[PDB]
Structure formats: C-alpha cells, structure tokens
Amino acid sequence: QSNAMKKEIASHLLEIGAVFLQPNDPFTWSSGMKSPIYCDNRLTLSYPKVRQTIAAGLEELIKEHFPTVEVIAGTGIAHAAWVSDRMDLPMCYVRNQIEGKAEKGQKVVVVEDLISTGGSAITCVEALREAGCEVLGIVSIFTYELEAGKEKLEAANVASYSLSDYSALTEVAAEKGIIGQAETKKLQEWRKNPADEAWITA
Amino acid sequence: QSNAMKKEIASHLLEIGAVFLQPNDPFTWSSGMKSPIYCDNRLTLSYPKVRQTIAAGLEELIKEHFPTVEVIAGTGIAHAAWVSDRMDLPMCYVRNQIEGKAEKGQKVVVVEDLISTGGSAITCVEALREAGCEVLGIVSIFTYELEAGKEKLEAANVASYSLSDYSALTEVAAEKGIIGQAETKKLQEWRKNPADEAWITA
Ligand SMILES: [Cl-]
Ligand SMILES: [Cl-]
Ligand SMILES: [Cl-]
Ligand SMILES: [Cl-]
Ligand SMILES: [Cl-]
Ligand SMILES: [Cl-]
Ligand SMILES: [Cl-]
Ligand SMILES: [Cl-]
Ligand SMILES: [Cl-]
Ligand SMILES: [Cl-]
Ligand SMILES: [Cl-]
Ligand SMILES: [Cl-]
Ligand SMILES: [Cl-]
Ligand SMILES: [Cl-]
C-alpha cells in the first residue's frame, strides 16, 4: 500500500508501455503542449493480471477512503466495471449524460484513468452532483500531480486519491535506469510549470 | 442454456427495464422509425447480479461456440470487461480505432450489447479484420432478429449468437401478461417488415 503500491504500479505501467517518458525529445500533446510524459491507461486492457492488480488497488483505495460508497461511476468504463464487480456495486458512467442509474442522494465514487489538468475530473463530478448524487470523491490510476488539477479539485471540495503518481514514476524510472539525474531535473521543472518550455532545457 | 436461458434472460431484461414494449403506442427511434420495442442494455450496469448472470451467459456462449478465443473486443465495454475478467483474456474495444492490443492473427470474439440492423456489428468486425485479426464471431446480449442484420452477418461470414432474442422476449411478455395475442401479432409483423407501418394496425 501507499509508497510501495505507488512504485509497484509505476513499474508495471512503464513495463507494459502504459506510460512513456521522453524528457530529451518532448512529445507534443493533442493540445499542442510539449510534454516529457504521456499516459494511456487504455493499454492496461490488454494485460489481464496487471489490470486486475490495478482494479484491486482501486478497490483498496475506495475501502480505505470512501467506505460508504453505493455506486461506482466511470468516465475508465472498463476499470469501473472491474471495481464495481469486485465490490458488488451498481455502476454508471458519465460521457454530460449519465448512463446507468445515478439517483438523488446515492453515494458515488468516480473512477478515472488519469488526473491531468483537472478539467475532465471536474466535468464528471459536476454531472453527478447535478443529478443529485453525493460524490464521495475520486480514485484514479495515475496523476501528473499538476498544480492546476490540485487547485480545481480543492476548490470544488473533491477528495482525490491515485494508485500511482508522477513523483513515484520519476523515481522508479531513475532506479530502472530509464532516466538519470539530468532528466529528473527536467521532469521536476515540467510538473511545476508544464506550459513553460524552460523545462526542456532545465 | 438455450431456450431456458433465452427466456430467463428476457424475463430479467423486462424486470429491470432494459427492454420496453409498447406495440399499441409505438416508440419513435432516433432514426425516425416507429417501433414497438426499445432495448437499452446500458441499464444492466446498475444491477450487479443481473449483469453478472449476463456476463456468465456470454462467457458460456464463447466457451460453447468460440473456444479458441484469445482476445475479447467490446463496442459493450463494460460487458466485455466482465467477460474478459472471467476468462482471464486480454480485452480491446472498438470505437474505427481499436483501443488496446489487437494484433495480426489473434483470435477475437466481439461482445455486442444488441444486434439490430447489422450495421454496427459489421462496422466492429470490419475494424478488427482490417487490423489483421481473425474474428471468430460475435456474442450479444439481445437481438431483434431482423432479416437485414441476419443477411449482413451471413454475407460477411460472421457467426453470431445472442443470449436472448425478440422471439423469446415476446413469448415471456405474453406469459407475464404484459402483452396479449393481439399485440403478439403486431410484434410478429414488425420483425418481418420493420420499416413498413402496416404492423401498427396488424
Ligand atoms: Cl490514461
Ligand atoms: Cl498481464
Ligand atoms: Cl494473458
Ligand atoms: Cl465514506
Ligand atoms: Cl453511451
Ligand atoms: Cl483531469
Ligand atoms: Cl457531492
Ligand atoms: Cl442495448
Ligand atoms: Cl441485480
Ligand atoms: Cl445491489
Ligand atoms: Cl473456436
Ligand atoms: Cl477511447
Ligand atoms: Cl447491429
Ligand atoms: Cl475473420
């Protein structure tokens, strides 16, 4: 659990190619923003054991932090499916139409693949709150730990926990020799100011 | 299994509101076509036991008919998730981009919520064939048994099996007293010629 789980999960994500790092040759995201990292947890679908380890971890986060949960909401659908089955709970998903039942007062936990800028997380929470549900919080597989997302969730009073995060993944990548100390500095600078291209030459 | 399973599943679908019948007051589908029936299996997501009974049934259809399966493809994502977990198989899904691994020669089974006109089923099969996969066939929760769909799948050489179908559901609905003999005739005529509004006054 905690730090051990974060490093173990980061190791798996790197190993299966669900998270890529290229600090010396930046990726360009669909927004046009340069980044040393990209996460695509859709790839976990192809790994039956790794995806189960992830679903078990998400379930453990829910039991630990949101034990009164009544409904699981995905945005993500596959992992919400795996979590809701392990917990024998109704599921719904949010496109902002909600598919599946989400009734007034029901206690909901959101399952997200990734917390990035916070926009997509807030969009999902807002849909559920609009429907009358009590959103307990969010559990996600990964988070880039960006200040923008942190502030958005804090301001909306949404508790959020992730199985692994950028910090753990940077450390594991260095332990593995994928990156070194020079790239670690670039990774640290990107997280602090992701839209500022100074990180590229940090 | 077989007829028993089809009637049991139809009963559950009616009971949870996943299939509606209104032969005396036709629905208008998004295409503008009048219909005595509508199926929305997204509602099964809210029913932990019923959805498990469905996933177990889909798994049984795959074991019975497509035993050499290597990958489960959803289009549907939640049920493909439940089936792939029970079978410990990699999963992918098809939007026609394929998310998750679908490699050359891998034996794939498609999991569909509903077989209607055949268009959406063919679209999914074609994407997987284009990717180089061997599509073993399709398993679905429900089928309207329309001739249009039957012919499209036959012409593309795609084997298709459904847990329940229109015929079983009509029979169960009559047994339950939801519909009678007069409405049964209207239902029979719609299936034969769904775009011809003579069924409305059959
Ligand atoms: Cl992701
Ligand atoms: Cl695996
Ligand atoms: Cl495997
Ligand atoms: Cl709680
Ligand atoms: Cl949808
Ligand atoms: Cl986000
Ligand atoms: Cl709330
Ligand atoms: Cl459906
Ligand atoms: Cl249920
Ligand atoms: Cl329940
Ligand atoms: Cl086979
Ligand atoms: Cl997608
Ligand atoms: Cl179809
Ligand atoms: Cl094929």
Swiss-Prot record, chains A, B:
PROSITE patterns: PUR_PYR_PR_TRANSFER. One of its GO terms (biological process) is 'de novo' UMP biosynthetic process. GO terms for molecular function: magnesium ion binding; orotate phosphoribosyltransferase activity. Orotate binds at S116. Its cofactor is Mg(2+). It comes from the Bacteria. It catalyses: orotidine 5'-phosphate + diphosphate = orotate + 5-phospho-alpha-D-ribose 1-diphosphate. 5-phospho-alpha-D-ribose 1-diphosphate binds at R95, E112, D113, L114, I115, S116, T117, G118, G119, S120. Keywords: Glycosyltransferase, Magnesium, Pyrimidine biosynthesis, Transferase. It is an enzyme of class 2 (transferase). NCBIfam families: pyrE (TIGR00336). This is Orotate phosphoribosyltransferase. The gene is pyrE.
